[PDB]
């Protein structure tokens, strides 16, 4: 019987050396599971609240209050529940907290317990996590959307686009797709050395060279793909996270490379589509620019995937508003933006039912936890955004997808160019 | 370890007294599961082939060849496989057969093994079948689309529409929705007695009274809903299976109540939408009328759900062609039209990803097997078509949904009017 | 019974996106364990040989030959052995290979199997890995020697010292020591931003700012410690990896910041000891400069720990030669330099018996594997070198030490300033 | 789970027929273990206190108070602890007692519980005791230091040296080394019969013939080695326990064979090194003669192992003082001198880290318990002092080393002449 017996939490460090929550759940059958919670560098206004300790300790970023909340309140509210009743457990966490944004117990305390319970349920059932969450039909390995060059608020350069990604869509399999991603990243390291540009890594393991702007960054990436013996677009296509909220002024406009309107940003993005093998653009406009996004999606949404991150925050409520308004055609899925597995899967359901694609995403503050790799296959997103093929908080996810591919055998299918029908 | 050890089959009878396949699978951990295969009265041209024995025995409808195929060939090909690898098992069945339409081993032999393996995997994992297929997020109880009055090729009347269904969309829960369906069906029995019309049941448990046509049948149903103390549309809405292939002549047109064109049938259906609280119409045109369907879906598809049954036959290939052509907005899901659980779930995936709704369906020849009730919740269709609340091959499904609702507790949600946003 | 039943290997990626070996071992009692192998960016001449595939794939760095060697040859030679007989298993791996430097099967294939077997033995015995390797007396949490600023061959600067580390020796506990390391690293990020220097990370997660030389780097670190509210030396002391082989010419001398002799390098190092709270210096001279090292150890060895890395390569044979010659007073312990757990522990034994201290070390190419954290406590080194508190291939080790500290309860002791009696 | 459930004690007799403590521990998984406590004939001033009953019974040497202390107080303080947490259990015993020298509960009550818990933990983990204490690297069989001729306070003769030992350093294996020890002991019996000297045994199973002094005793032993067909020094070397405290007067000097100073005793010992194949001398000076020992160790410590017994009493505190002062180069390890396994292993750690060798030792009052044989291999001392190859309280240890050698197979290594690099 997979009845919850014990729930504990501890403070560990994330991949930027800031504290985060790790939760362990033990079931009465001796099943033990452990889940760690990611954290964003900068966050959407609309995200679930992380409980942070304040004061001097770790710059105010301690999570001892979250840890105490798991031991004093969450444990006692969920011990005796069946870990298979993920929706009951998640509803009891949400009711316990009693707030819209999980500001009392913290989204970080609550997601910790939610993910650990799911992991314990899967172990008890003797099923791999992808198969317990997705059922026996879970088999699709995601195209890895790999951040290899950074800009925006995440850089000390004149590039305002936050992330430049490669997507090995033409690969026959996920094992070959990871290798393609790795070989282009290694060749970009060599191209950067040869141009005398910096090869220091950012948070996501990508390079942050000081370059002129968006097209200069895309040209270096294209050179890297060719240098790896691969064809841009057919083999390795491109994607962006503009994260346009970071360069947007409330009620004013987009300060980009020139102040521009939503419609001008769209002309820019349209220009990039004509010049480059772009399959996806994330957050091309800001998190509350509902009019701009609708007009942009109407303009270019037939030609490229448009991903809502900060505009949706993995929230069914804000995503429903977007589907209604014809805003974006894809949802970035961040479990810690919403706080429970159940609410994450309701958002994925709302998207998938509504014709929108999904992309599972890391946070800039990640851990050795690989659960999003299992999530990406469980929900059959066909797309994952979990960093450069460097820094093991990113690579551990890619290694877990290798293991999932191997375990599926001839049942595995790599999403490849079927993730992006518009390209 | 849920390794397949034994696979046996026997000939049993379906709900019309014709033979069908039942398969039992035993795993090395002592797990035992049993699955029975439904059969259609009349079938789509494009369905997986049922192996039938021919000769005198049971009118040519014996399934001893299918039973022998399970023992001589399928068992030996899948023993030693892990029952958790549903896609490997289904691929090995499809490769074993080696034909497009499963004409060598039979769709009936193959689906038997496929469904029994899935059931055995769920038992081994100690999970209810809905939760093993759908994962921990499976929680949505379907609106029951209950056939209470028949016509077409299934009748001796002037009604050409095959099925008239009630849909208790306004109910707060599936337990109340089943009761509403039952009380309207009982009141329709009383209305029919009072009009001197026949109360003999058809295959699906609905009545087949000799009435004038479509609007006469809808009026009697509306009287029944009011007689039960319920409001037509707000509480109990209406749906149809025209099954228009049954009154279509190849290259000619629709002989309906008058020969009509696809566009004329659409004017008729449009007329019914203005006069009646219709939420869904299945097969309004014939199985290969791709032009007619596109024009109909363009005309009324914003106003009502349009379900493809015979046009799609639960086939990813034919459904892809429909999505491309803007044909229908819903897929009728019939596991035995395609032959494996895996191919059924790929069709559901293709639909759900593509913005199309799904409705799990019985066949006119059903069994005491309740697996489609678990399927409807697993895939979160929000809709099931499994007969009148009479004849236990129909009622056993409704009873299994009660048990699933009870087991989910406060996690259960009834789809209600959210299954039909267009109404 | 912990009899080895199955041995498998797969190619995964390390923290620099290059391939490495991961090995899984299953025992007949159902115990399953997984071990990943690290890889050095540049290597000592004397290290165990890594089998690499060559050709185009992953730049020649594929490990498919190593993976095949684990499946074709190692598995068959160790299945049926008791996983508790670590020395028998390691001797059978060494005899199987039949070469001095493990050049036939590869140090990477062999260490994979060695570490996985040890992990499986610990799981079977139901003991944490630190307690199975070190016995019930294992309780000492290491001072973390955290690389926060890089130079040498690992940089594009004028600093020739490869690694600048902080050592929180004055902390009351490992949990406080990790926090001190994290807060100084965060304050160094702020000091670097304020001097307009690069905050891109190197392989070990440290910063690589373009600075003048050794004393400029030490001054920035000292500013960071003070900025964190900590006292240099008393709270946070300093350590170096000169890696002097990287700037040494065979038979010629040390090109450093000026060509210098071994004795001149020693005058430099002696100067740094008078000016800075240095507790340790690794590889102050080159890997085969036996005369230089003896004279340096005689000169300053009473005043500071002198660590042999490339001079010893975790080899009992080369370490014995050093003890005999009065060369160094500490051994850097790198399991993959020697290839088996058993030979690693014989080197630690030879050192500890001989009055030499040990420091467990990461490689620049690391994985999500945390086994060296368990090793550092098992052998009671009191010292570990496993990166900056950034990049989870480094932080996962620090998180595992937190978990080990918590599990020991009041039995835990933090090595603190007792790791460095000379300071 | 190896949780302590029951702790009982009984009074048994030691090898001299005096009472001692035996402790049994039962764990909740059904593991049962038994440990007996040795006792010294005469003791160091600084040893842990043995609780003795006083009065008439067994000459005042009853241990009923110790037995009662195990049942009334120790059991209740350690039941519910994990037997794997040896340091927590030992700390709880030390805190319970609350005294420096364990004078309240008794070192004999406390060591009984400590050793039984360790044995129970090893059984629960299904590991031999040497492997549970020493980890998988424990493999070194000790040179047996076998007392074959006695003098001092342990005799009625003019020999003031307490123990004359043979050390079969040249043997290829422990099985051959035991045989060499046995054959020399049998030949010494024959040499003694032929000189008309007594063949009655002392407490340690050695002979106590009435001889002239030290050189007369060494000559008889040398004759015995030759008579066995072995070469003195190359095959069988010699060692001494002077136990010089027994012939030392507080503040006065050494009454030996002549009153002598520390420096004169050293001239004597130096003379014996020139004339005889001596590898080790234990307690050459008295337990508090810190100046004498330093000067002696400076004089001859390069030429022979100098073992501290009564000067260290297996106490980390007194051993630290010796390492600081350059006093001795080896620690005699007597678990009952300190009272817990944990404090014994901290003393071994302090020694081994500090370049000092260890020799595990029996007490003159021994039992059928063989645990020190497992300890000697666990800590890889390479040396054990556990009597003549006569009297089964001595031989049971040698028999247990045979069993440990056999169980290690080709992983076993005999320390041989590598235990004594100075010879
Ligand atoms: Cl919820
Ligand atoms: Cl869309
Ligand atoms: Cl998707
Ligand atoms: Cl298939
Ligand atoms: Cl649609
Ligand atoms: Cl649906
Ligand atoms: Cl070896
Ligand atoms: Cl030294
Ligand atoms: Cl050390
Ligand atoms: Cl202690
Ligand atoms: Cl020494
Ligand atoms: Cl030793
Ligand atoms: Mg974003
Ligand atoms: Mg139909
Ligand atoms: Mg180094
Ligand atoms: Mg003694």
Author numbering:
A (entry chain A), B (entry chain A), C (entry chain A), D (entry chain A): 1 to 257, 259 to 424
From the paper:
Enolase, a ubiquitous enzyme, catalyzes the reversible conversion of 2-phospho­glycerate (2PG) to phospho­enolpyruvate (PEP) in the glycolytic pathway of organisms of all three domains of life. Here we present structural snapshots of Mycobacterium tuberculosis (Mtb) enolase in apo, PEP-bound and two 2PG-bound forms as it catalyzes the conversion of PEP to 2PG. MtEno has a topology similar to other enolase structures, a smaller N-terminal domain and a larger C-terminal domain. The crystal and the cryoEM structures (enzyme in solution, frozen) along with the biochemical studies clearly demonstrate that the functional unit of MtEno is an octamer.
Tautomerization resonance is accelerated on acidification of the carboxyl group of 2PG which is accomplished through its lone-pair-mediated coordination with both the Mg2+ ions and the transfer of a proton from His154 onto the nearest oxygen linked to the phosphate moiety. To find out if the exact reverse of this reaction occurs during the conversion of PEP to 2PG, we systematically mutated each of the residues Ser42, Asp241, Glu163, Glu204 and Lys335 to alanine, compared their activity with wild type MtEno, and elucidated the structures of three of them [Figs. 4(a) and 4(b)].
